[PDB]
Amino acid sequence: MENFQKVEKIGEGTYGVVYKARNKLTGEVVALKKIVPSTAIREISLLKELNHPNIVKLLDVIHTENKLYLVFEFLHQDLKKFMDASALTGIPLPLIKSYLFQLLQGLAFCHSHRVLHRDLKPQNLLINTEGAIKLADFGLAREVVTLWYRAPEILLGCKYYSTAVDIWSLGCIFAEMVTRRALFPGDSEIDQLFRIFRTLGTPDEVVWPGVTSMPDYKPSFPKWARQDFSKVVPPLDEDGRSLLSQMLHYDPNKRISAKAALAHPFFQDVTKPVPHLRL
Ligand SMILES: Brc1cnn2c(NCc3cccnc3)cc(-c3ccccc3)nc12
Numbered sequence: 001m002e003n004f005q006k007v008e009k010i011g012e013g014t015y016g017v018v019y020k021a022r023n024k025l026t027g028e029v030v031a032l033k034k035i036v037p038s039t040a041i042r043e044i045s046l047l048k049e050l051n052h053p054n055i056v057k058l059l060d061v062i063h064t065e066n067k068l069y070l071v072f073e074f075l076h077q078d079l080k081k082f083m084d085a086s087a088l089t090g091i092p093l094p095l096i097k098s099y100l101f102q103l104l105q106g107l108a109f110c111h112s113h114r115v116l117h118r119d120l121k122p123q124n125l126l127i128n129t130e131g132a133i134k135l136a137d138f139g140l141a142r143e144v145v146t147l148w149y150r151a152p153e154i155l156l157g158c159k160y161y162s163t164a165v166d167i168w169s170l171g172c173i174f175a176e177m178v179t180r181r182a183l184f185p186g187d188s189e190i191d192q193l194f195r196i197f198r199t200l201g202t203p204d205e206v207v208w209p210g211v212t213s214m215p216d217y218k219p220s221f222p223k224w225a226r227q228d229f230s231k232v233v234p235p236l237d238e239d240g241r242s243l244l245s246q247m248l249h250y251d252p253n254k255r256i257s258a259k260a261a262l263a264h265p266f267f268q269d270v271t272k273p274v275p276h277l278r279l
Contacts, residue, residue: 002024003024004021004071007022008020010031011123012143015034029074031073032070033069040068047115050113052106053134054102054134055135056126072136078127080121083176086275090180096174097266097269098271098272101267102132102134107166110139110166116142119149121146121169127277151169153214155192161252165252170247198224198227200227201225201226203250229245242266243261243264246261
């Protein structure tokens with residue numbers, strides 16, 4: 001740790017403080033996360049090999065004094081801050097599409113390696129001046145924590161959920177980019193679940209076979225009717241709404257995969273614009 005000079009706290013991750021820092025040696029500017037069980041060390045060690053242009057690079061893993069420090073590549077801005085900055089006119093559709101496309105590429109990569117993120121949220125989607133967007137904290141899961149992006153199968157007590165939970169989260173973020181308001185801003189697990197039911201309809205055996213057997217499912221759940229996506233994410237076009245609908249499928253087995261999503265017609269005209277970043 002004496003090999004780094006802390007420049008500033010750049011947030012408070014779900015595992016500890018995150019600092020912009022400088023390598024007192026090479027002068028390199030990095031993101032330093034302060035998080036030990038052997039399982040943790042081995043698993044994290046695998047993460048150092050999971051390299052892709054849309055995944056924030058894990059430079060080094062420092063274990064000292066029973067302390068765990070993760071050294072990452074540094075990115076100047078996160079998607080929450082950017083959405084807040086583009087709140088007046090909204091993020092241009094071509095840039096939303098680009099970002100969604102890139103994130104789907106990062107997801108497809110991780111998923112092909114059986115690595116899940118599990119906690120995707122605007123705060124951990126990082127952007128740079130070149131129009132790149134990257135996933136931060138991938139594989140780590142394996143201040144109130146936000147439930148807004150949590151998949152229904154997790155909320156219903158599914159113990160062995162899979163890659164589909166990340167597609168759900170990314171669907172919620174896509175919607176938020178488009179409308180400029182959180183899709184399902186729950187402030188408790190039941191509030192989150194009910195916000196989802198009120199919009200997508202209370203799930204049942206017809207749309208989600210086996211849902212009624214889920215650990216936390218209750219027959220006493222109110223039965224709300226599903227809303228039209230046209231009302232949910234105006235003025236997203238038909239391609240966008242169609243893709244969104246597939247990313248928000250209740251059944252995790254019906255939920256579109258990242259790889260399939262990349263082939264959706266929505267991306268037919270994808271480009272890579274440059275955002276205006278005021279650092
Ligand atoms: Br790895 C990592 C590399 N950059 N980075 C950033 N940079 C964005 C930024 C830069 C400068 C000032 N404020 C924000 C934020 C978070 C993060 C992730 C989760 C929660 C909080 C922060 N993790 C990282």
